[PDB]
């Protein structure tokens, strides 16, 4: 009663968004290295027991719809849900190839009132993206 | 009877708010590759916060950005865990 109940038919879905190439208008560079990210991640999360799906170069509209539809699926026999975002980002926001969309809007699809089959179930978002431009210089 | 709608979320950001996050064209990004490495070794026996805390340590300690490196001379990064979880999370059993 201090741990989440993991006795379900399957652990759950793992959605990986692998944004590498971006429209020039956004001013954002090719994210070299992200494929090796994406590739360590699915092997990794597959090994835990997730049903892993990898999407590549998604538009903002694509990213929204995709997560929206996932929210709307039946997670009844799933223990949890995981989503991993690999893209450019600025504070509170993450890049599609098309432009930016807020993290809140992406995750809100899974709120308890909007995804009842993941109610009382852990919802995991891993975010590889910048959150601003400040640099950390270190110390000692 | 009821449950907050924002409850049971966990966010594992690669960096703290306002700050930059690093990616190596050859190898991948620091955060992910630290994340996976620890998950490969401990995903099955450690609680999620333990895992992510250990990830925080490795990104913080094991990584710097070198001196001959232009643009970004010996720079550092710390990830950022946001937990609204209501229980301990183990990926097994």
């Amino acid at each position: 009663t201090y741990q989440y109940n993991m006795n379900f038919e399957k652990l759950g879905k793992c959605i990986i968004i692998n944004n590498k190439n971006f429209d020039k208008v956004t001013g954002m560079g090719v994210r070299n290295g992200t494929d090796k990210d994406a590739e360590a991640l699915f092997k990794c999360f597959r090994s835990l027991g997730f049903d892993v799906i990898v999407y590549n170069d998604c538009s903002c509209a694509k990213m929204q719809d995709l997560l929206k539809k996932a929210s709307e699926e039946d997670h009844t026999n799933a223990a949890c849900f995981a989503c991993i975002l690999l893209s450019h980002g600025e504070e509170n926001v993450i890049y599609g190839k098309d432009g930016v969309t807020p993290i809140k809007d992406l995750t809100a699809h899974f709120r308890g009132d909007r995804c009842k089959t993941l109610l009382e179930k852990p919802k995991l978002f891993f975010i590889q993206a910048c959150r601003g431009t400040e640099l950390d210089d270190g110390i000692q | 009877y009821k449950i907050p709608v924002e409850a049971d979320f966990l966010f594992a950001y690669s960096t703290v708010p306002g700050y930059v996050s690093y990616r190596v064209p050859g190898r991948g990004s620091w955060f992910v590759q630290a994340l996976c490495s620890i998950l490969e070794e401990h995903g099955k026996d450690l609680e999620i916060m333990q895992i992510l805390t250990r990830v925080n340590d490795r990104v913080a300690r094991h990584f710097e950005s070198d001196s001959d490196d232009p643009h970004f001379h010996e720079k550092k990064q710390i990830p950022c865990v946001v937990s609204m979880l209501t229980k301990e999370l183990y990926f097994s059993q």
Partner: peptide, 4 residues
């Protein structure tokens, strides 16, 4: 290194 590059930045996201």
């Amino acid at each position: 290194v590059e930045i996201x």
